[PDB]
């Protein structure tokens, strides 16, 4: 039916899908650590059910549950995985008003300062499969260096398919110091029709960057579509690198998970800021996606199927012998309720793990500190 | 092959399943408010996938995704079937359940109310369920009736309740409950839902006591909330302001569950599961913690590790340094919401009669008299 | 003028003084650990100024800044300073005695009782307005103190730093009050080791015990000004933050007013404070019960009702704070987002040896666990 | 005998005094109304005891408990300076006269008029022989610069500090620029004070330090921050915070907090380290003890103290004795004791409007209704 660029050009709002990888980990099919997708062949019914839950939630994009392979004889079964995945994706995408998207991300074999040629071959190696499976469009995501991302877009444009590029960096800028605005520019110039940011930072942060990007493009005449797919984790204490530096990553993030109301707020802000491809990254479960779609329903003209088992703002609580519980079926109540953590012995924030060791500072100052205390004790 | 009572008698640890209803709500198949299971026929593949995820997590019980019908009967049947199918795929049994009824509260008489339990029992009889479970009771009075009604089947009966350490809505302490419940024929007794892990085990101790101080003997069962509810006044987390759309933050971590599972086991509980909030990985936490004792790891552990182990690898040193039990067992995880409190006062309405009001007048007057002195 | 018993019998509300010892520690005249009063002779002007600040705050009692000892000169210099300030206003002087190792390593009833008499002497020689056997946990001993003090024929008020649970020997609050009044205490209550809210829970119990025994007496409370919801059983002393990191738990004037109101409504007629109570805290008690007492303490001269002094102020939002409703309901912030709101007490609950046998079973479980993963994962 | 500039030039560390006004408010001598010093004559013994507690704590400066106004106020000011001088004389300390942001400027009252004020106050300070002058509380370099200028008239050393963080001053006059302009205007000592907790306060200093360095101008660094943790200071000082000024209790710093700050301050180059609102005597004592090794002595107040909980060595309880360690107190995340309260609060300021505010609610209201609409339609299918 309608392609990515068409939808956007028609003024439509493209609902993205959520955090596939994390959802499967909690369901028992993906192992935190390597975070690989071999379940697409080991447990297809699981991968399928998830894609369907997102589709039901209103998601318009089924991102392939793929991964870069080549892992060694000297080749890969990982390729069968990737293909099985694209297929499952396509199957579910076909079941609804959705497209399939192939993705590629930050290459370790780059952070070894290899070369644009070598690294770029990777992106092409993956592009192949996406070509063969005839994906609807491509997405370069999970990037902290425009430098590289720019390469990906370039490598992908080869396909002649629409290209979307988000980055996993917030406020400040990328790792080399490049500000968000510059990024967007460079990225669109490199051919990205859709640009934005994904994962690494929570909803609020993520939209701060978008504004900046938005700015950069405006102050350069370049025009493109805005995209955001943030964490569903509240990360106000995120110092840098993303929530990965947070002590709780990735087994104690439970409490930071956003509520449906949190997501609606974000979706509203996003839309009002101009973002038109609104999705989510790690942490986004099906109901989170459903929150985006319900919040913008008035604008889109419809409710996703999943809303069948839902209500406006607690409405399904109209009924219920208890008055105080029925009194919660109101937008005003949920939109303002400061929910409790349930953990009075825990802080509300944590210092990142950064350990970008200054150096002997973790020695000298420490030593100097130790000595100062003793000299001090002496004067006593 | 092995039945519920056999497993327990063999010294085995029966891993229960989790919070089916809540999980489907987040997945988009159960509407909050009515909380009904019509998806067993509208979207069987969904119900099936969940039962399988729990089974994969190490769960030994597939509780029927049934309910009480005013058809809804086809629903119930379709559910039991799906349950049985998945149960058959692994080392698990199917269990039929019944709970508190609106009619009890509409003081409807032991006869009338008891008919309900029998109406549901029928289906469970017809779909050869391995055993029965009377859960979700705030009044032993009624629960006792359920057990009685169910014993009719001659199948093993487990009765859990949602009551804190202070007894039920009739003042009956936990110990008394357990007694009355086992005397009524429950071979397995314990507490389910309405109270987080820690609390839930406080009651068990009490129940344990009551049975011990009465010579009655039975098997202990617990299936708590996966929600930290230290601010729960009384009448479960349902009275909490955040119920049921803002509980996110209180969700337990796998480490929280392991701790609980360990305490539970050490306290003597042998049927350890979970209620609302329990997702597949939570069940997997129970099974992994007691793996040494049980002799095996559930399949789901294939995509897991001991205590963060899968983090051994990872170019980052500080992240690799997290692959340790000591690290996760002691880490005080942050809420990520610095503008929110860590606790909330329940909603549970008590007064507005004489009090309440004056809890406004005398205060108003005091302020004025005070202002006067100035 | 009016004696202790008279005041109470006239229906009057006796405002107690605050946490002398802690206030002088923060001012630099008392050292924590020994917490002795040798400043009464080393820096009398300091001790004097404090007694005066409380007196100005509305306090009706100047408790001697005495100790257990030259230490005797100290004690005498203290009583004198007390008397001098007490004389400057509508206040009485009170001599106190508390739980000391005479009972610790168990020095009988004879030996221990001699102590109380040794201190009583000085109090007799200064003709204090009344006696207070405070800071107690074992009624057993407290009962001895009251007995030893009755010897003086002066009124005896009694207070124990104990919870809604019961004395250290295990006897419930009600029993305590009974035993204490029977032993001759005309005034009974609890002081220290627990925050406002808790402290009043016990009073209710005590109140009960006396009522359910026909015994009649006056109720007294002098709690901590520290919020201690996480207090386990042996006072805030077992709390990790004792005594150098209690800052955040300090009560606000509004907190104190609330307490004073509850206390009064419950029947307490001798309302004061212990550790943590600064002058303005005392002033909060007196202002809250002002309507009832008929007057405001002098210190109110530099104060206002409920933020009233904020009427003025070019800023509207700041002027909008000059209201009881605003301060009585404002959930003040901690300002420490990286800190928990509660802490587990320290009291090694004698596991002994298990504190080292359980920590074994855990170690072993982890290894056995690690073992299973090794086997099962290395074979599909 | 040693003057302010001498001390600093000798490499010495000048310990400032604390939050006099707030301390007297809690003690019952300063009304939270307009915060005036009439107690210097109504209750001298109180003012005296405080100055002495700071002096005992190691403070080297007794700032006059003065105030800008006929109102029986000049006698007040004089009585204050005297009390100050008396206590200053009792130890190794100097007296300092201060002036701050005044209502004039905020009503736009010509540099001439406003400047007269500073001179009116200067007079008294001249007459009582204050050792040096201080321009604290300044939210506009523009004005502060005027103060310094007005004060240089005295030929006495001039110290500058302001209540405005890294964002810079109201006029977008970044911290660096401020320091520059301030020293150029004659300030020998520059820094920040009031309305920014320890951590923040030192962030600005670094900036100022920078500005001066990148301009060859040289001067002495000074900081006297709040003893209140204000991570939520949305913008304006803690005055915009909901809890100001009667619910700040919980944010109060601990002695350990202060030591940390004092250490950072010193390491950053600050040599005049004091405190503003919230600083009690023991807070000052924390600064002095932390830098004791460097200074060569402990203030008298340390007589009733210990290194890091040392006084806990004794105590029948093992777990309590185990707390007599720097490592324990320096790392202990102290609890708030208020599980029903948040750890942060949004400041009070106000986005005027007439647009999407009287409307934010409108579009929101309408969206909810349209949303509600869609729900009815589909549950009919
Ligand atoms: Zn992600
Ligand atoms: Zn439940
Ligand atoms: Zn005390
Ligand atoms: Zn200040």
PDB file of C-alpha atoms in Angstrom, chain B residues 176-351:
ATOM      1  CA  UNK B 176      -6.427 -19.731  62.520  1.00  0.00           C
ATOM      2  CA  UNK B 177      -7.022 -19.412  58.788  1.00  0.00           C
ATOM      3  CA  UNK B 178      -4.471 -22.072  57.845  1.00  0.00           C
ATOM      4  CA  UNK B 179      -5.956 -24.337  60.500  1.00  0.00           C
ATOM      5  CA  UNK B 180      -9.532 -23.884  59.385  1.00  0.00           C
ATOM      6  CA  UNK B 181      -8.458 -24.236  55.758  1.00  0.00           C
ATOM      7  CA  UNK B 182      -6.561 -27.487  56.212  1.00  0.00           C
ATOM      8  CA  UNK B 183      -9.311 -28.872  58.445  1.00  0.00           C
ATOM      9  CA  UNK B 184     -11.653 -28.024  55.606  1.00  0.00           C
ATOM     10  CA  UNK B 185      -9.459 -30.273  53.473  1.00  0.00           C
ATOM     11  CA  UNK B 186      -6.687 -28.139  51.968  1.00  0.00           C
ATOM     12  CA  UNK B 187      -3.518 -30.182  51.462  1.00  0.00           C
ATOM     13  CA  UNK B 188      -1.662 -27.052  50.409  1.00  0.00           C
ATOM     14  CA  UNK B 189      -2.080 -23.687  52.099  1.00  0.00           C
ATOM     15  CA  UNK B 190      -0.608 -20.225  51.824  1.00  0.00           C
ATOM     16  CA  UNK B 191      -1.114 -16.646  50.681  1.00  0.00           C
ATOM     17  CA  UNK B 192      -1.535 -15.085  47.193  1.00  0.00           C
ATOM     18  CA  UNK B 193      -1.499 -11.511  45.791  1.00  0.00           C
ATOM     19  CA  UNK B 194      -2.338  -8.301  47.699  1.00  0.00           C
ATOM     20  CA  UNK B 195       1.084  -8.169  49.438  1.00  0.00           C
ATOM     21  CA  UNK B 196       4.676  -7.866  48.175  1.00  0.00           C
ATOM     22  CA  UNK B 197       7.273 -10.626  48.714  1.00  0.00           C
ATOM     23  CA  UNK B 198       8.542  -9.605  52.172  1.00  0.00           C
ATOM     24  CA  UNK B 199       5.120  -9.124  53.737  1.00  0.00           C
ATOM     25  CA  UNK B 200       3.746 -12.290  52.182  1.00  0.00           C
ATOM     26  CA  UNK B 201       6.382 -14.365  53.928  1.00  0.00           C
ATOM     27  CA  UNK B 202       5.619 -12.768  57.294  1.00  0.00           C
ATOM     28  CA  UNK B 203       2.133 -14.234  57.144  1.00  0.00           C
ATOM     29  CA  UNK B 204       3.359 -17.631  56.023  1.00  0.00           C
ATOM     30  CA  UNK B 205       5.437 -17.806  59.199  1.00  0.00           C
ATOM     31  CA  UNK B 206       2.301 -17.079  61.214  1.00  0.00           C
ATOM     32  CA  UNK B 207       0.251 -19.644  59.290  1.00  0.00           C
ATOM     33  CA  UNK B 208       3.114 -22.097  59.670  1.00  0.00           C
ATOM     34  CA  UNK B 209       2.885 -21.442  63.413  1.00  0.00           C
ATOM     35  CA  UNK B 210      -0.874 -21.945  63.624  1.00  0.00           C
ATOM     36  CA  UNK B 211      -0.649 -25.322  61.920  1.00  0.00           C
ATOM     37  CA  UNK B 212       2.292 -26.406  64.051  1.00  0.00           C
ATOM     38  CA  UNK B 213       0.459 -25.381  67.220  1.00  0.00           C
ATOM     39  CA  UNK B 214      -2.445 -27.623  66.252  1.00  0.00           C
ATOM     40  CA  UNK B 215      -0.676 -30.730  64.957  1.00  0.00           C
ATOM     41  CA  UNK B 216      -2.329 -30.132  61.567  1.00  0.00           C
ATOM     42  CA  UNK B 217       0.195 -30.655  58.784  1.00  0.00           C
ATOM     43  CA  UNK B 218       0.127 -29.304  55.223  1.00  0.00           C
ATOM     44  CA  UNK B 219       2.188 -27.841  52.394  1.00  0.00           C
ATOM     45  CA  UNK B 220       3.035 -24.131  52.324  1.00  0.00           C
ATOM     46  CA  UNK B 221       2.334 -21.986  49.287  1.00  0.00           C
ATOM     47  CA  UNK B 222       3.083 -18.377  48.352  1.00  0.00           C
ATOM     48  CA  UNK B 223       2.402 -16.376  45.186  1.00  0.00           C
ATOM     49  CA  UNK B 224       2.923 -12.685  46.087  1.00  0.00           C
ATOM     50  CA  UNK B 225       2.902  -9.444  44.182  1.00  0.00           C
ATOM     51  CA  UNK B 226       6.023  -8.531  42.241  1.00  0.00           C
ATOM     52  CA  UNK B 227       5.335  -5.024  43.491  1.00  0.00           C
ATOM     53  CA  UNK B 228       7.123  -3.485  46.456  1.00  0.00           C
ATOM     54  CA  UNK B 229       4.313  -2.339  48.707  1.00  0.00           C
ATOM     55  CA  UNK B 230       5.827  -1.153  52.018  1.00  0.00           C
ATOM     56  CA  UNK B 231       3.180   1.558  52.190  1.00  0.00           C
ATOM     57  CA  UNK B 232       0.296  -0.903  51.882  1.00  0.00           C
ATOM     58  CA  UNK B 233      -2.002   0.040  54.763  1.00  0.00           C
ATOM     59  CA  UNK B 234      -4.481  -2.766  54.449  1.00  0.00           C
ATOM     60  CA  UNK B 235      -6.730  -4.101  51.726  1.00  0.00           C
ATOM     61  CA  UNK B 236      -3.956  -4.807  49.261  1.00  0.00           C
ATOM     62  CA  UNK B 237      -2.230  -2.666  46.720  1.00  0.00           C
ATOM     63  CA  UNK B 238      -5.655  -2.031  45.231  1.00  0.00           C
ATOM     64  CA  UNK B 239      -6.129   0.807  47.721  1.00  0.00           C
ATOM     65  CA  UNK B 240      -2.832   2.281  46.574  1.00  0.00           C
ATOM     66  CA  UNK B 241      -3.134   5.448  44.457  1.00  0.00           C
ATOM     67  CA  UNK B 242      -1.065   3.886  41.710  1.00  0.00           C
ATOM     68  CA  UNK B 243      -3.304   0.880  41.180  1.00  0.00           C
ATOM     69  CA  UNK B 244      -3.285  -0.278  38.542  1.00  0.00           C
ATOM     70  CA  UNK B 245      -1.762   2.084  35.990  1.00  0.00           C
ATOM     71  CA  UNK B 246       1.219   3.535  37.837  1.00  0.00           C
ATOM     72  CA  UNK B 247       2.768   0.526  39.560  1.00  0.00           C
ATOM     73  CA  UNK B 248       5.694   0.367  37.142  1.00  0.00           C
ATOM     74  CA  UNK B 249       8.365   1.546  39.627  1.00  0.00           C
ATOM     75  CA  UNK B 250       7.442  -0.948  42.334  1.00  0.00           C
ATOM     76  CA  UNK B 251       8.075  -3.905  40.061  1.00  0.00           C
ATOM     77  CA  UNK B 252      10.581  -6.314  41.532  1.00  0.00           C
ATOM     78  CA  UNK B 253      13.871  -7.170  39.877  1.00  0.00           C
ATOM     79  CA  UNK B 254      15.069 -10.711  39.265  1.00  0.00           C
ATOM     80  CA  UNK B 255      17.392 -10.250  42.223  1.00  0.00           C
ATOM     81  CA  UNK B 256      14.473  -9.242  44.414  1.00  0.00           C
ATOM     82  CA  UNK B 257      12.702 -12.433  43.469  1.00  0.00           C
ATOM     83  CA  UNK B 258      15.731 -14.648  44.109  1.00  0.00           C
ATOM     84  CA  UNK B 259      16.031 -13.203  47.611  1.00  0.00           C
ATOM     85  CA  UNK B 260      12.363 -13.927  48.242  1.00  0.00           C
ATOM     86  CA  UNK B 261      12.539 -17.400  46.743  1.00  0.00           C
ATOM     87  CA  UNK B 262      15.455 -18.146  49.031  1.00  0.00           C
ATOM     88  CA  UNK B 263      13.695 -16.877  52.121  1.00  0.00           C
ATOM     89  CA  UNK B 264      10.532 -18.692  51.131  1.00  0.00           C
ATOM     90  CA  UNK B 265      12.337 -22.012  50.692  1.00  0.00           C
ATOM     91  CA  UNK B 266      14.312 -21.611  53.875  1.00  0.00           C
ATOM     92  CA  UNK B 267      11.038 -20.926  55.702  1.00  0.00           C
ATOM     93  CA  UNK B 268       9.616 -24.204  54.409  1.00  0.00           C
ATOM     94  CA  UNK B 269       7.437 -23.026  51.508  1.00  0.00           C
ATOM     95  CA  UNK B 270       7.479 -25.662  48.786  1.00  0.00           C
ATOM     96  CA  UNK B 271       5.048 -24.297  46.215  1.00  0.00           C
ATOM     97  CA  UNK B 272       6.644 -20.991  45.249  1.00  0.00           C
ATOM     98  CA  UNK B 273       5.101 -18.819  42.567  1.00  0.00           C
ATOM     99  CA  UNK B 274       3.918 -15.285  41.955  1.00  0.00           C
ATOM    100  CA  UNK B 275       0.819 -13.185  41.391  1.00  0.00           C
ATOM    101  CA  UNK B 276       0.198  -9.842  39.679  1.00  0.00           C
ATOM    102  CA  UNK B 277       3.377  -8.341  38.299  1.00  0.00           C
ATOM    103  CA  UNK B 278       5.259 -11.580  37.811  1.00  0.00           C
ATOM    104  CA  UNK B 279       6.614 -11.712  34.279  1.00  0.00           C
ATOM    105  CA  UNK B 280       8.424 -14.737  32.838  1.00  0.00           C
ATOM    106  CA  UNK B 281      11.896 -13.715  34.081  1.00  0.00           C
ATOM    107  CA  UNK B 282      10.543 -13.421  37.605  1.00  0.00           C
ATOM    108  CA  UNK B 283       9.540 -17.070  37.578  1.00  0.00           C
ATOM    109  CA  UNK B 284      12.939 -17.867  36.116  1.00  0.00           C
ATOM    110  CA  UNK B 285      14.474 -16.153  39.130  1.00  0.00           C
ATOM    111  CA  UNK B 286      12.689 -18.494  41.542  1.00  0.00           C
ATOM    112  CA  UNK B 287      13.826 -21.554  39.628  1.00  0.00           C
ATOM    113  CA  UNK B 288      17.427 -20.414  39.276  1.00  0.00           C
ATOM    114  CA  UNK B 289      17.744 -19.566  42.955  1.00  0.00           C
ATOM    115  CA  UNK B 290      16.568 -22.996  43.998  1.00  0.00           C
ATOM    116  CA  UNK B 291      18.290 -24.755  41.099  1.00  0.00           C
ATOM    117  CA  UNK B 292      21.064 -26.091  43.342  1.00  0.00           C
ATOM    118  CA  UNK B 293      18.341 -27.702  45.477  1.00  0.00           C
ATOM    119  CA  UNK B 294      16.214 -28.911  42.566  1.00  0.00           C
ATOM    120  CA  UNK B 295      19.110 -30.243  40.504  1.00  0.00           C
ATOM    121  CA  UNK B 296      18.279 -28.435  37.274  1.00  0.00           C
ATOM    122  CA  UNK B 297      17.877 -25.111  35.492  1.00  0.00           C
ATOM    123  CA  UNK B 298      14.688 -24.337  33.576  1.00  0.00           C
ATOM    124  CA  UNK B 299      15.064 -24.080  29.810  1.00  0.00           C
ATOM    125  CA  UNK B 300      14.772 -20.282  29.851  1.00  0.00           C
ATOM    126  CA  UNK B 301      18.148 -20.206  31.630  1.00  0.00           C
ATOM    127  CA  UNK B 302      19.637 -20.981  28.225  1.00  0.00           C
ATOM    128  CA  UNK B 303      19.385 -17.286  27.427  1.00  0.00           C
ATOM    129  CA  UNK B 304      20.608 -16.214  30.847  1.00  0.00           C
ATOM    130  CA  UNK B 305      23.526 -16.419  33.259  1.00  0.00           C
ATOM    131  CA  UNK B 306      24.196 -16.783  36.987  1.00  0.00           C
ATOM    132  CA  UNK B 307      24.379 -13.268  38.379  1.00  0.00           C
ATOM    133  CA  UNK B 308      25.049 -10.957  35.479  1.00  0.00           C
ATOM    134  CA  UNK B 309      27.561 -13.437  34.036  1.00  0.00           C
ATOM    135  CA  UNK B 310      26.559 -12.626  30.459  1.00  0.00           C
ATOM    136  CA  UNK B 311      28.332  -9.370  31.188  1.00  0.00           C
ATOM    137  CA  UNK B 312      31.736 -11.095  31.494  1.00  0.00           C
ATOM    138  CA  UNK B 313      32.282  -9.968  27.928  1.00  0.00           C
ATOM    139  CA  UNK B 314      31.853  -6.282  27.055  1.00  0.00           C
ATOM    140  CA  UNK B 315      34.673  -3.924  26.148  1.00  0.00           C
ATOM    141  CA  UNK B 316      33.755  -1.817  29.167  1.00  0.00           C
ATOM    142  CA  UNK B 317      35.479  -2.773  32.473  1.00  0.00           C
ATOM    143  CA  UNK B 318      32.939  -1.156  34.790  1.00  0.00           C
ATOM    144  CA  UNK B 319      30.161  -3.022  33.039  1.00  0.00           C
ATOM    145  CA  UNK B 320      32.039  -6.317  33.232  1.00  0.00           C
ATOM    146  CA  UNK B 321      32.590  -5.650  36.923  1.00  0.00           C
ATOM    147  CA  UNK B 322      28.828  -5.998  37.350  1.00  0.00           C
ATOM    148  CA  UNK B 323      28.777  -9.700  36.511  1.00  0.00           C
ATOM    149  CA  UNK B 324      28.793 -10.626  40.182  1.00  0.00           C
ATOM    150  CA  UNK B 325      26.208 -11.804  42.688  1.00  0.00           C
ATOM    151  CA  UNK B 326      27.682  -9.531  45.331  1.00  0.00           C
ATOM    152  CA  UNK B 327      27.162  -6.531  43.064  1.00  0.00           C
ATOM    153  CA  UNK B 328      23.513  -7.129  42.130  1.00  0.00           C
ATOM    154  CA  UNK B 329      22.439  -8.485  45.495  1.00  0.00           C
ATOM    155  CA  UNK B 330      23.526  -5.305  47.232  1.00  0.00           C
ATOM    156  CA  UNK B 331      22.984  -2.586  44.662  1.00  0.00           C
ATOM    157  CA  UNK B 332      20.304  -0.171  45.844  1.00  0.00           C
ATOM    158  CA  UNK B 333      18.704   0.549  42.496  1.00  0.00           C
ATOM    159  CA  UNK B 334      17.494   4.096  41.831  1.00  0.00           C
ATOM    160  CA  UNK B 335      13.933   5.113  41.047  1.00  0.00           C
ATOM    161  CA  UNK B 336      14.832   7.608  38.332  1.00  0.00           C
ATOM    162  CA  UNK B 337      12.054   9.890  39.618  1.00  0.00           C
ATOM    163  CA  UNK B 338      13.609  12.539  41.950  1.00  0.00           C
ATOM    164  CA  UNK B 339      10.352  14.476  42.026  1.00  0.00           C
ATOM    165  CA  UNK B 340       8.370  11.522  43.310  1.00  0.00           C
ATOM    166  CA  UNK B 341       8.093  10.107  46.834  1.00  0.00           C
ATOM    167  CA  UNK B 342       9.078   6.552  47.667  1.00  0.00           C
ATOM    168  CA  UNK B 343       5.766   5.877  49.405  1.00  0.00           C
ATOM    169  CA  UNK B 344       2.085   6.797  49.164  1.00  0.00           C
ATOM    170  CA  UNK B 345      -0.813   6.736  51.605  1.00  0.00           C
ATOM    171  CA  UNK B 346      -3.588   4.259  50.652  1.00  0.00           C
ATOM    172  CA  UNK B 347      -6.999   5.578  49.557  1.00  0.00           C
ATOM    173  CA  UNK B 348      -9.162   3.347  51.833  1.00  0.00           C
ATOM    174  CA  UNK B 349     -12.044   5.480  53.136  1.00  0.00           C
ATOM    175  CA  UNK B 350     -12.698   5.510  56.854  1.00  0.00           C
ATOM    176  CA  UNK B 351     -14.036   8.824  58.144  1.00  0.00           C
TER     177      UNK B 351
END
